[PDB]
Design a protein around this ligand. Structure first.
Ligand SMILES: [Cl-]
Length: 584
Protein backbone atom coordinates (compact mmCIF):
# COMPACT_ATOMS: atom_id res chain seq x y z
CA UNK A 1 0.00 0.00 0.00
CA UNK A 2 2.14 2.91 1.32
CA UNK A 3 5.12 4.80 -0.14
CA UNK A 4 8.24 4.34 2.08
CA UNK A 5 10.57 7.23 2.95
CA UNK A 6 12.36 8.45 -0.19
CA UNK A 7 15.58 10.37 -0.55
CA UNK A 8 15.89 12.64 -2.36
CA UNK A 9 12.16 13.60 -2.52
CA UNK A 10 11.06 12.97 -6.13
CA UNK A 11 9.82 15.97 -8.03
CA UNK A 12 6.54 14.36 -9.10
CA UNK A 13 5.01 11.31 -7.48
CA UNK A 14 1.41 10.16 -7.84
CA UNK A 15 -0.09 7.12 -6.07
CA UNK A 16 -2.27 5.43 -8.73
CA UNK A 17 -3.20 2.08 -7.09
CA UNK A 18 -3.22 0.11 -3.86
CA UNK A 19 0.17 -1.48 -4.65
CA UNK A 20 1.27 -5.06 -5.26
CA UNK A 21 3.82 -7.67 -4.20
CA UNK A 22 6.77 -8.38 -6.52
CA UNK A 23 7.08 -12.12 -7.28
CA UNK A 24 9.92 -14.35 -6.02
CA UNK A 25 11.48 -14.13 -9.45
CA UNK A 26 10.94 -11.53 -12.18
CA UNK A 27 10.91 -10.91 -15.91
CA UNK A 28 13.68 -8.40 -16.79
CA UNK A 29 13.37 -6.48 -20.06
CA UNK A 30 15.74 -3.94 -21.62
CA UNK A 31 19.05 -5.25 -20.08
CA UNK A 32 20.85 -5.49 -23.45
CA UNK A 33 20.31 -1.77 -24.02
CA UNK A 34 19.99 -0.16 -20.56
CA UNK A 35 22.86 1.66 -18.75
CA UNK A 36 25.27 -1.00 -17.41
CA UNK A 37 25.91 0.71 -14.08
CA UNK A 38 22.16 0.96 -13.50
CA UNK A 39 21.57 -2.73 -14.43
CA UNK A 40 24.31 -3.77 -11.95
CA UNK A 41 22.79 -1.74 -9.15
CA UNK A 42 19.51 -3.41 -9.99
CA UNK A 43 21.09 -6.90 -10.07
CA UNK A 44 22.80 -6.28 -6.69
CA UNK A 45 19.55 -5.22 -5.05
CA UNK A 46 17.62 -8.13 -6.56
CA UNK A 47 20.19 -10.59 -5.19
CA UNK A 48 20.32 -8.97 -1.75
CA UNK A 49 16.55 -9.42 -1.57
CA UNK A 50 16.26 -12.97 -2.97
CA UNK A 51 14.50 -11.99 -6.17
CA UNK A 52 15.70 -14.20 -9.02
CA UNK A 53 15.85 -13.26 -12.71
CA UNK A 54 13.91 -15.49 -15.09
CA UNK A 55 15.82 -17.26 -17.90
CA UNK A 56 12.59 -17.01 -19.89
CA UNK A 57 9.38 -15.02 -19.63
CA UNK A 58 6.51 -15.29 -17.24
CA UNK A 59 5.58 -17.88 -14.69
CA UNK A 60 3.48 -14.73 -14.49
CA UNK A 61 6.17 -13.13 -12.53
CA UNK A 62 6.44 -9.40 -12.11
CA UNK A 63 7.92 -7.63 -15.16
CA UNK A 64 10.66 -5.00 -14.80
CA UNK A 65 11.50 -2.93 -17.90
CA UNK A 66 14.63 -0.78 -17.82
CA UNK A 67 16.17 1.73 -20.30
CA UNK A 68 16.97 5.24 -21.45
CA UNK A 69 14.76 7.18 -23.86
CA UNK A 70 15.86 6.59 -27.46
CA UNK A 71 16.94 3.00 -26.58
CA UNK A 72 15.17 0.36 -28.73
CA UNK A 73 12.82 -1.15 -26.10
CA UNK A 74 9.23 -1.11 -27.43
CA UNK A 75 7.99 -2.67 -24.12
CA UNK A 76 9.14 0.34 -22.08
CA UNK A 77 6.88 2.89 -23.79
CA UNK A 78 3.93 0.47 -23.46
CA UNK A 79 4.52 0.07 -19.73
CA UNK A 80 5.17 3.78 -19.10
CA UNK A 81 1.88 4.60 -20.89
CA UNK A 82 1.92 8.39 -21.21
CA UNK A 83 4.66 9.01 -18.66
CA UNK A 84 8.10 9.73 -20.10
CA UNK A 85 11.59 10.99 -19.36
CA UNK A 86 12.00 12.64 -22.80
CA UNK A 87 11.08 16.22 -21.77
CA UNK A 88 13.19 16.00 -18.59
CA UNK A 89 16.62 17.53 -17.90
CA UNK A 90 19.89 15.56 -17.79
CA UNK A 91 19.93 12.93 -14.97
CA UNK A 92 16.10 12.81 -15.12
CA UNK A 93 13.97 9.63 -15.12
CA UNK A 94 10.40 8.35 -15.08
CA UNK A 95 9.25 5.38 -13.02
CA UNK A 96 5.88 3.68 -13.30
CA UNK A 97 4.76 0.74 -11.18
CA UNK A 98 1.34 -0.54 -12.10
CA UNK A 99 -0.48 -3.88 -12.01
CA UNK A 100 2.44 -6.37 -12.01
CA UNK A 101 4.83 -4.17 -14.06
CA UNK A 102 7.65 -1.75 -13.20
CA UNK A 103 9.06 0.55 -15.86
CA UNK A 104 12.22 2.61 -15.32
CA UNK A 105 13.23 5.04 -18.03
CA UNK A 106 16.16 7.47 -17.74
CA UNK A 107 16.60 10.62 -19.83
CA UNK A 108 20.24 9.41 -19.99
CA UNK A 109 22.14 6.53 -18.35
CA UNK A 110 22.63 8.66 -15.18
CA UNK A 111 18.80 9.07 -14.97
CA UNK A 112 18.31 5.34 -15.30
CA UNK A 113 20.74 4.69 -12.46
CA UNK A 114 18.83 7.15 -10.26
CA UNK A 115 15.51 5.48 -11.19
CA UNK A 116 17.02 2.24 -9.94
CA UNK A 117 17.98 4.04 -6.72
CA UNK A 118 14.38 5.18 -6.36
CA UNK A 119 13.01 1.66 -7.07
CA UNK A 120 15.28 0.22 -4.34
CA UNK A 121 13.87 2.65 -1.76
CA UNK A 122 10.26 2.01 -2.93
CA UNK A 123 10.32 -1.74 -2.32
CA UNK A 124 9.59 -3.03 1.20
CA UNK A 125 9.52 -6.82 1.69
CA UNK A 126 8.71 -7.27 -2.00
CA UNK A 127 5.79 -4.88 -1.69
CA UNK A 128 5.73 -1.83 -3.90
CA UNK A 129 3.21 1.05 -4.17
CA UNK A 130 1.62 1.86 -7.54
CA UNK A 131 3.14 5.19 -8.55
CA UNK A 132 3.66 7.53 -11.47
CA UNK A 133 7.01 9.33 -11.03
CA UNK A 134 8.90 11.89 -13.13
CA UNK A 135 12.02 13.19 -11.39
CA UNK A 136 15.17 15.28 -12.01
CA UNK A 137 17.55 17.36 -9.87
CA UNK A 138 17.28 21.03 -8.99
CA UNK A 139 21.07 21.51 -9.06
CA UNK A 140 23.33 19.99 -11.73
CA UNK A 141 26.29 19.08 -9.47
CA UNK A 142 25.58 17.73 -5.97
CA UNK A 143 28.23 16.28 -3.67
CA UNK A 144 31.13 16.24 -1.22
CA UNK A 145 34.50 17.96 -1.01
CA UNK A 146 36.85 16.08 1.27
CA UNK A 147 38.46 19.23 2.57
CA UNK A 148 38.45 18.80 6.34
CA UNK A 149 41.47 18.80 8.61
CA UNK A 150 42.16 16.01 11.06
CA UNK A 151 42.32 12.24 10.80
CA UNK A 152 41.79 11.35 7.11
CA UNK A 153 39.11 9.02 5.88
CA UNK A 154 40.50 5.51 5.16
CA UNK A 155 40.40 3.89 1.75
CA UNK A 156 37.48 1.78 2.94
CA UNK A 157 35.68 4.87 4.26
CA UNK A 158 35.95 6.52 0.84
CA UNK A 159 34.68 3.47 -1.02
CA UNK A 160 31.66 3.30 1.33
CA UNK A 161 30.95 7.09 0.98
CA UNK A 162 31.05 6.79 -2.83
CA UNK A 163 28.37 4.03 -2.71
CA UNK A 164 26.36 6.08 -0.25
CA UNK A 165 26.55 9.06 -2.69
CA UNK A 166 25.22 7.03 -5.62
CA UNK A 167 22.35 5.69 -3.45
CA UNK A 168 21.29 9.24 -2.62
CA UNK A 169 21.85 10.70 -6.15
CA UNK A 170 24.91 12.81 -5.24
CA UNK A 171 27.07 12.95 -8.34
CA UNK A 172 30.28 14.73 -7.21
CA UNK A 173 33.18 13.81 -4.97
CA UNK A 174 36.13 16.24 -4.82
CA UNK A 175 39.13 14.24 -3.79
CA UNK A 176 41.70 16.51 -2.17
CA UNK A 177 42.67 14.96 1.17
CA UNK A 178 45.36 16.63 3.36
CA UNK A 179 46.95 13.15 3.73
CA UNK A 180 47.73 12.61 0.00
CA UNK A 181 50.98 14.42 -0.97
CA UNK A 182 50.20 14.07 -4.69
CA UNK A 183 47.53 16.75 -4.39
CA UNK A 184 49.77 19.32 -2.65
CA UNK A 185 53.30 18.68 -1.41
CA UNK A 186 54.07 16.64 -4.51
CA UNK A 187 51.54 18.24 -6.88
CA UNK A 188 53.92 18.14 -9.85
CA UNK A 189 54.47 14.39 -9.66
CA UNK A 190 52.36 11.61 -11.21
CA UNK A 191 51.16 8.94 -8.77
CA UNK A 192 53.82 6.20 -8.52
CA UNK A 193 52.99 2.54 -9.23
CA UNK A 194 52.46 1.71 -5.55
CA UNK A 195 49.61 4.23 -5.33
CA UNK A 196 47.80 3.29 -8.54
CA UNK A 197 45.58 0.44 -7.42
CA UNK A 198 44.30 2.63 -4.60
CA UNK A 199 43.61 5.56 -6.91
CA UNK A 200 42.05 3.31 -9.61
CA UNK A 201 39.63 1.74 -7.13
CA UNK A 202 38.34 5.20 -6.15
CA UNK A 203 38.02 6.27 -9.84
CA UNK A 204 36.34 2.98 -10.71
CA UNK A 205 33.86 3.15 -7.82
CA UNK A 206 33.00 6.75 -8.65
CA UNK A 207 32.20 5.82 -12.26
CA UNK A 208 30.13 2.76 -11.19
CA UNK A 209 27.97 4.95 -8.95
CA UNK A 210 27.71 7.81 -11.45
CA UNK A 211 29.92 9.96 -9.17
CA UNK A 212 32.18 12.56 -10.89
CA UNK A 213 35.59 11.99 -9.32
CA UNK A 214 37.12 15.44 -9.21
CA UNK A 215 40.84 15.57 -8.63
CA UNK A 216 41.68 18.57 -6.40
CA UNK A 217 45.18 20.00 -6.87
CA UNK A 218 46.70 22.70 -4.60
CA UNK A 219 49.87 24.00 -6.27
CA UNK A 220 49.89 27.10 -4.06
CA UNK A 221 52.57 25.77 -1.70
CA UNK A 222 55.31 26.47 -4.27
CA UNK A 223 54.00 27.16 -7.79
CA UNK A 224 55.93 29.76 -9.84
CA UNK A 225 54.18 32.18 -12.28
CA UNK A 226 56.87 34.55 -13.59
CA UNK A 227 58.90 33.81 -16.73
CA UNK A 228 60.42 30.41 -17.55
CA UNK A 229 60.05 28.94 -14.03
CA UNK A 230 56.33 29.75 -14.45
CA UNK A 231 56.44 28.04 -17.86
CA UNK A 232 58.01 24.87 -16.49
CA UNK A 233 55.39 24.73 -13.72
CA UNK A 234 52.40 25.20 -16.04
CA UNK A 235 53.83 22.26 -17.94
CA UNK A 236 54.05 20.18 -14.71
CA UNK A 237 50.37 21.05 -14.17
CA UNK A 238 49.65 19.72 -17.67
CA UNK A 239 51.74 16.57 -17.27
CA UNK A 240 50.09 15.84 -13.89
CA UNK A 241 46.55 16.40 -15.26
CA UNK A 242 47.50 14.07 -18.15
CA UNK A 243 48.66 11.26 -15.81
CA UNK A 244 45.34 11.59 -13.95
CA UNK A 245 43.35 11.67 -17.23
CA UNK A 246 45.15 8.46 -18.27
CA UNK A 247 43.86 6.55 -15.28
CA UNK A 248 40.31 7.81 -15.97
CA UNK A 249 39.94 11.21 -14.27
CA UNK A 250 37.55 13.56 -16.08
CA UNK A 251 37.11 16.45 -13.54
CA UNK A 252 39.74 18.74 -12.06
CA UNK A 253 39.92 21.39 -9.36
CA UNK A 254 42.71 23.92 -8.89
CA UNK A 255 42.76 25.60 -5.45
CA UNK A 256 44.30 29.01 -4.70
CA UNK A 257 43.10 29.25 -1.12
CA UNK A 258 46.52 28.83 0.55
CA UNK A 259 49.05 30.57 -1.69
CA UNK A 260 51.55 33.25 -0.59
CA UNK A 261 51.83 34.99 -4.02
CA UNK A 262 48.30 36.55 -3.88
CA UNK A 263 48.06 37.63 -7.54
CA UNK A 264 44.61 37.32 -9.14
CA UNK A 265 45.91 37.94 -12.66
CA UNK A 266 48.37 35.05 -12.30
CA UNK A 267 45.90 32.55 -10.76
CA UNK A 268 43.35 33.28 -13.50
CA UNK A 269 46.01 33.04 -16.21
CA UNK A 270 46.97 29.54 -15.08
CA UNK A 271 43.27 28.56 -15.09
CA UNK A 272 42.52 30.03 -18.50
CA UNK A 273 45.57 28.43 -20.06
CA UNK A 274 44.66 25.09 -18.42
CA UNK A 275 41.02 25.40 -19.56
CA UNK A 276 42.39 25.86 -23.06
CA UNK A 277 45.35 23.47 -23.39
CA UNK A 278 43.79 20.66 -21.35
CA UNK A 279 40.04 20.86 -20.65
CA UNK A 280 39.08 21.89 -24.24
CA UNK A 281 41.84 19.97 -25.99
CA UNK A 282 40.50 16.81 -24.34
CA UNK A 283 36.82 17.21 -25.29
CA UNK A 284 35.46 15.00 -22.46
CA UNK A 285 36.68 16.90 -19.43
CA UNK A 286 33.98 18.43 -17.27
CA UNK A 287 34.23 22.19 -16.52
CA UNK A 288 37.29 23.34 -14.59
CA UNK A 289 36.74 24.08 -10.94
CA UNK A 290 38.58 26.65 -8.81
CA UNK A 291 38.83 28.03 -5.25
CA UNK A 292 40.05 31.62 -5.53
CA UNK A 293 42.22 32.99 -2.69
CA UNK A 294 39.23 35.09 -1.51
CA UNK A 295 36.47 32.50 -1.16
CA UNK A 296 34.01 33.90 1.36
CA UNK A 297 31.98 37.12 0.98
CA UNK A 298 33.79 38.93 3.85
CA UNK A 299 37.14 38.33 2.17
CA UNK A 300 35.74 38.98 -1.36
CA UNK A 301 33.68 42.09 -0.86
CA UNK A 302 33.98 45.49 0.78
CA UNK A 303 31.07 48.01 0.94
CA UNK A 304 29.04 45.92 -1.56
CA UNK A 305 31.88 46.05 -4.13
CA UNK A 306 34.48 43.40 -4.95
CA UNK A 307 37.90 43.83 -3.36
CA UNK A 308 40.80 44.06 -5.82
CA UNK A 309 41.74 40.36 -5.95
CA UNK A 310 38.09 39.33 -6.57
CA UNK A 311 37.60 42.22 -9.03
CA UNK A 312 40.60 41.12 -11.13
CA UNK A 313 40.06 37.33 -10.75
CA UNK A 314 36.42 37.68 -11.87
CA UNK A 315 37.22 39.95 -14.83
CA UNK A 316 39.96 37.55 -15.97
CA UNK A 317 38.63 34.04 -15.28
CA UNK A 318 37.08 32.18 -18.26
CA UNK A 319 33.18 32.17 -18.18
CA UNK A 320 33.11 28.32 -18.21
CA UNK A 321 35.14 27.85 -15.02
CA UNK A 322 33.16 26.95 -11.88
CA UNK A 323 34.14 29.28 -9.04
CA UNK A 324 33.55 28.07 -5.46
CA UNK A 325 32.65 30.18 -2.45
CA UNK A 326 31.63 29.30 1.07
CA UNK A 327 28.95 31.97 1.61
CA UNK A 328 29.05 35.21 3.73
CA UNK A 329 31.89 33.66 5.74
CA UNK A 330 33.98 30.51 5.85
CA UNK A 331 31.65 28.83 8.42
CA UNK A 332 28.39 30.86 8.68
CA UNK A 333 24.73 30.54 9.72
CA UNK A 334 23.43 31.00 6.24
CA UNK A 335 23.53 31.83 2.58
CA UNK A 336 20.65 34.20 1.98
CA UNK A 337 19.55 34.74 -1.61
CA UNK A 338 20.99 38.30 -1.54
CA UNK A 339 24.52 36.92 -0.88
CA UNK A 340 24.34 34.48 -3.80
CA UNK A 341 22.90 37.28 -5.97
CA UNK A 342 25.86 39.53 -4.97
CA UNK A 343 28.65 36.96 -5.65
CA UNK A 344 26.91 35.67 -8.82
CA UNK A 345 26.59 39.28 -10.04
CA UNK A 346 30.33 39.90 -9.41
CA UNK A 347 31.28 36.75 -11.37
CA UNK A 348 28.55 37.02 -14.02
CA UNK A 349 27.70 33.26 -13.74
CA UNK A 350 26.13 30.55 -11.61
CA UNK A 351 28.29 29.92 -8.62
CA UNK A 352 29.56 26.78 -6.94
CA UNK A 353 29.06 26.34 -3.18
CA UNK A 354 31.60 24.84 -0.76
CA UNK A 355 29.42 24.52 2.30
CA UNK A 356 31.36 24.01 5.53
CA UNK A 357 28.82 21.84 7.37
CA UNK A 358 28.88 19.17 8.80
CA UNK A 359 32.71 19.66 8.93
CA UNK A 360 33.84 19.82 12.58
CA UNK A 361 37.65 20.29 12.25
CA UNK A 362 37.46 23.77 13.95
CA UNK A 363 35.58 22.37 16.93
CA UNK A 364 36.33 18.64 17.02
CA UNK A 365 34.76 17.78 20.41
CA UNK A 366 31.31 18.19 18.91
CA UNK A 367 29.58 16.16 16.24
CA UNK A 368 27.57 17.99 13.57
CA UNK A 369 24.45 15.89 13.15
CA UNK A 370 21.87 18.34 11.82
CA UNK A 371 20.33 19.02 8.40
CA UNK A 372 21.29 21.56 5.77
CA UNK A 373 20.25 24.72 7.58
CA UNK A 374 20.32 28.39 6.58
CA UNK A 375 20.64 27.76 2.83
CA UNK A 376 18.03 29.71 0.89
CA UNK A 377 15.49 27.58 -1.01
CA UNK A 378 15.83 29.85 -4.06
CA UNK A 379 19.64 29.39 -4.22
CA UNK A 380 19.49 27.46 -7.53
CA UNK A 381 18.77 30.79 -9.17
CA UNK A 382 22.47 31.73 -8.78
CA UNK A 383 24.17 28.38 -8.05
CA UNK A 384 24.34 25.17 -10.07
CA UNK A 385 27.03 23.32 -8.13
CA UNK A 386 26.59 22.39 -4.46
CA UNK A 387 29.06 20.62 -2.23
CA UNK A 388 29.36 19.99 1.49
CA UNK A 389 32.53 19.64 3.51
CA UNK A 390 31.93 16.74 5.93
CA UNK A 391 33.45 15.55 9.26
CA UNK A 392 36.52 13.36 9.69
CA UNK A 393 33.76 11.07 11.06
CA UNK A 394 32.68 9.45 7.78
CA UNK A 395 29.83 7.33 9.22
CA UNK A 396 27.96 10.04 11.20
CA UNK A 397 28.53 12.55 8.41
CA UNK A 398 25.89 10.57 6.52
CA UNK A 399 23.01 12.12 8.50
CA UNK A 400 23.75 15.67 7.26
CA UNK A 401 24.90 14.50 3.81
CA UNK A 402 21.57 12.63 3.52
CA UNK A 403 19.74 15.97 3.92
CA UNK A 404 22.08 17.66 1.47
CA UNK A 405 21.06 15.07 -1.16
CA UNK A 406 17.42 16.10 -0.61
CA UNK A 407 18.22 19.86 -0.53
CA UNK A 408 20.20 20.01 -3.82
CA UNK A 409 18.05 17.55 -5.78
CA UNK A 410 14.62 18.90 -4.66
CA UNK A 411 15.27 22.36 -3.29
CA UNK A 412 11.86 24.00 -3.58
CA UNK A 413 10.33 21.43 -1.29
CA UNK A 414 13.22 21.02 1.20
CA UNK A 415 12.00 20.93 4.80
CA UNK A 416 15.03 20.73 7.06
CA UNK A 417 13.10 19.20 9.99
CA UNK A 418 11.35 16.48 7.96
CA UNK A 419 14.57 15.83 5.91
CA UNK A 420 16.49 15.41 9.19
CA UNK A 421 13.94 12.98 10.69
CA UNK A 422 13.86 11.01 7.47
CA UNK A 423 17.70 10.86 7.38
CA UNK A 424 17.79 9.21 10.80
CA UNK A 425 14.72 7.02 10.13
CA UNK A 426 16.44 5.82 6.90
CA UNK A 427 19.94 5.27 8.31
CA UNK A 428 19.20 3.83 11.79
CA UNK A 429 16.31 1.39 11.58
CA UNK A 430 14.94 0.41 14.96
CA UNK A 431 17.51 2.73 16.58
CA UNK A 432 16.12 5.82 14.74
CA UNK A 433 14.05 7.18 17.62
CA UNK A 434 16.92 6.81 20.12
CA UNK A 435 19.34 8.29 17.56
CA UNK A 436 17.06 11.34 17.12
CA UNK A 437 16.97 11.98 20.88
CA UNK A 438 20.81 12.14 20.84
CA UNK A 439 21.47 13.87 17.52
CA UNK A 440 18.78 16.46 18.33
CA UNK A 441 21.23 17.82 20.96
CA UNK A 442 24.10 17.97 18.52
CA UNK A 443 23.26 20.14 15.51
CA UNK A 444 24.61 23.64 16.40
CA UNK A 445 28.27 24.42 15.65
CA UNK A 446 30.08 27.37 17.23
CA UNK A 447 33.76 27.77 18.18
CA UNK A 448 32.90 31.08 19.96
CA UNK A 449 35.01 33.12 17.55
CA UNK A 450 34.90 32.97 13.73
CA UNK A 451 32.99 29.78 12.94
CA UNK A 452 29.34 29.01 13.59
CA UNK A 453 26.56 27.18 11.76
CA UNK A 454 23.67 24.71 12.00
CA UNK A 455 20.18 24.41 13.42
CA UNK A 456 20.00 25.31 17.13
CA UNK A 457 20.27 22.27 19.44
CA UNK A 458 17.04 20.74 20.76
CA UNK A 459 14.85 23.89 20.06
CA UNK A 460 11.68 22.51 21.62
CA UNK A 461 13.50 21.46 24.81
CA UNK A 462 15.17 24.87 24.98
CA UNK A 463 11.66 26.51 24.69
CA UNK A 464 10.28 24.33 27.52
CA UNK A 465 13.27 25.29 29.67
CA UNK A 466 12.63 29.01 28.92
CA UNK A 467 8.97 28.51 29.88
CA UNK A 468 10.01 26.92 33.18
CA UNK A 469 12.14 29.93 34.17
CA UNK A 470 9.42 32.38 33.29
CA UNK A 471 6.75 30.40 35.15
CA UNK A 472 8.98 30.05 38.21
CA UNK A 473 9.89 33.76 38.09
CA UNK A 474 6.25 34.81 37.53
CA UNK A 475 4.69 32.82 40.44
CA UNK A 476 2.91 30.54 38.00
CA UNK A 477 2.57 26.86 38.96
CA UNK A 478 5.52 25.07 37.29
CA UNK A 479 4.70 21.50 38.41
CA UNK A 480 3.65 20.28 35.00
CA UNK A 481 6.74 21.65 33.36
CA UNK A 482 8.95 20.12 36.06
CA UNK A 483 7.16 16.75 35.61
CA UNK A 484 7.59 16.92 31.81
CA UNK A 485 11.26 17.89 31.98
CA UNK A 486 11.97 14.95 34.34
CA UNK A 487 10.56 12.73 31.57
CA UNK A 488 12.68 14.33 28.94
CA UNK A 489 15.99 14.09 30.82
CA UNK A 490 15.27 10.47 31.73
CA UNK A 491 14.61 9.79 28.01
CA UNK A 492 17.94 11.39 26.98
CA UNK A 493 19.71 9.01 29.28
CA UNK A 494 17.64 5.94 28.19
CA UNK A 495 18.23 6.69 24.49
CA UNK A 496 21.99 7.17 24.88
CA UNK A 497 22.33 3.96 26.89
CA UNK A 498 20.51 2.01 24.23
CA UNK A 499 22.76 3.56 21.58
CA UNK A 500 25.93 2.60 23.56
CA UNK A 501 24.69 -1.00 23.78
CA UNK A 502 23.35 -1.45 20.22
CA UNK A 503 24.96 0.97 17.78
CA UNK A 504 27.44 -0.82 15.51
CA UNK A 505 31.10 -0.10 16.18
CA UNK A 506 31.53 1.89 12.93
CA UNK A 507 29.11 4.51 14.40
CA UNK A 508 29.96 3.95 18.06
CA UNK A 509 33.70 4.62 17.63
CA UNK A 510 32.74 8.04 16.31
CA UNK A 511 30.39 9.09 19.11
CA UNK A 512 30.88 7.07 22.26
CA UNK A 513 32.37 10.04 24.18
CA UNK A 514 29.52 12.43 23.10
CA UNK A 515 27.01 9.77 24.20
CA UNK A 516 28.58 9.61 27.72
CA UNK A 517 28.62 13.37 27.78
CA UNK A 518 24.88 13.66 26.95
CA UNK A 519 24.18 11.11 29.71
CA UNK A 520 26.22 13.16 32.23
CA UNK A 521 24.36 16.32 31.20
CA UNK A 522 20.93 14.61 31.50
CA UNK A 523 21.96 13.57 34.98
CA UNK A 524 22.85 17.19 35.91
CA UNK A 525 19.63 18.39 34.23
CA UNK A 526 17.76 15.99 36.55
CA UNK A 527 19.69 17.19 39.64
CA UNK A 528 18.84 20.71 38.52
CA UNK A 529 15.08 19.93 38.72
CA UNK A 530 15.75 18.35 42.09
CA UNK A 531 17.20 21.69 43.21
CA UNK A 532 14.03 23.53 42.12
CA UNK A 533 11.69 21.03 43.82
CA UNK A 534 13.77 21.25 47.03
CA UNK A 535 13.37 25.03 47.04
CA UNK A 536 9.56 24.69 46.45
CA UNK A 537 9.60 22.21 49.33
CA UNK A 538 11.89 24.44 51.44
CA UNK A 539 14.18 21.45 52.07
CA UNK A 540 17.65 22.89 52.51
CA UNK A 541 19.46 19.54 52.75
CA UNK A 542 17.80 18.09 49.68
CA UNK A 543 18.77 21.37 47.96
CA UNK A 544 22.50 21.17 48.85
CA UNK A 545 22.74 17.51 47.80
CA UNK A 546 21.08 18.09 44.42
CA UNK A 547 23.28 21.16 43.84
CA UNK A 548 26.47 19.17 44.47
CA UNK A 549 25.52 16.60 41.84
CA UNK A 550 24.40 19.24 39.38
CA UNK A 551 27.71 21.04 39.88
CA UNK A 552 29.67 17.78 39.54
CA UNK A 553 28.00 16.73 36.36
CA UNK A 554 28.57 20.16 34.82
CA UNK A 555 32.27 19.96 35.92
CA UNK A 556 32.71 16.56 34.18
CA UNK A 557 31.17 18.03 30.96
CA UNK A 558 33.34 21.11 31.03
CA UNK A 559 36.41 18.97 31.64
CA UNK A 560 35.67 16.54 28.75
CA UNK A 561 36.92 16.58 25.19
CA UNK A 562 33.38 15.71 24.01
CA UNK A 563 31.04 18.69 23.51
CA UNK A 564 27.20 18.61 23.09
CA UNK A 565 24.06 20.60 23.85
CA UNK A 566 26.03 23.69 25.05
CA UNK A 567 23.09 26.10 25.05
CA UNK A 568 20.57 23.53 26.18
CA UNK A 569 21.37 20.54 28.42
CA UNK A 570 24.56 22.20 29.58
CA UNK A 571 23.40 25.81 29.96
CA UNK A 572 20.33 24.56 31.89
CA UNK A 573 22.56 23.34 34.79
CA UNK A 574 24.30 26.74 34.90
CA UNK A 575 20.84 28.45 34.84
CA UNK A 576 19.52 26.22 37.61
CA UNK A 577 22.63 26.65 39.73
CA UNK A 578 22.15 30.43 39.62
CA UNK A 579 18.38 30.28 40.24
CA UNK A 580 16.92 31.20 43.62
CA UNK A 581 13.21 30.76 44.16
CA UNK A 582 13.20 32.67 47.51
CA UNK A 583 13.77 35.95 45.57
CA UNK A 584 10.57 35.68 43.47
CL1 LIG B 1 18.85 7.02 1.76
Amino acid sequence: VLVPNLNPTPENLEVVGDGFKITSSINLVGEEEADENAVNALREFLTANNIEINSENDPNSTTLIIGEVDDDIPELDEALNGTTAENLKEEGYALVSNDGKIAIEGKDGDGTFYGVQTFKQLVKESNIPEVNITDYPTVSARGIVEGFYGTPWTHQDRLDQIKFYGENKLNTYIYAPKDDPYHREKWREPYPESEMQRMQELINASAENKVDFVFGISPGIDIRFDGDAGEEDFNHLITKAESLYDMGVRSFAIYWDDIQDKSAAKHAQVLNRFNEEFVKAKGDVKPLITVPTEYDTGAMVSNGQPRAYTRIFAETVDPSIEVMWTGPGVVTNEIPLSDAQLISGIYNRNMAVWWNYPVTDYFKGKLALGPMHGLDKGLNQYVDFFTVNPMEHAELSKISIHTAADYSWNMDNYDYDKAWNRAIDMLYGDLAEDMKVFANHSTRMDNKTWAKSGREDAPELRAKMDELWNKLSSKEDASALIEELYGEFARMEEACNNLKANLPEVALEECSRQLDELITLAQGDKASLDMIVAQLNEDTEAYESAKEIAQNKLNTALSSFAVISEKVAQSFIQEALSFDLTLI
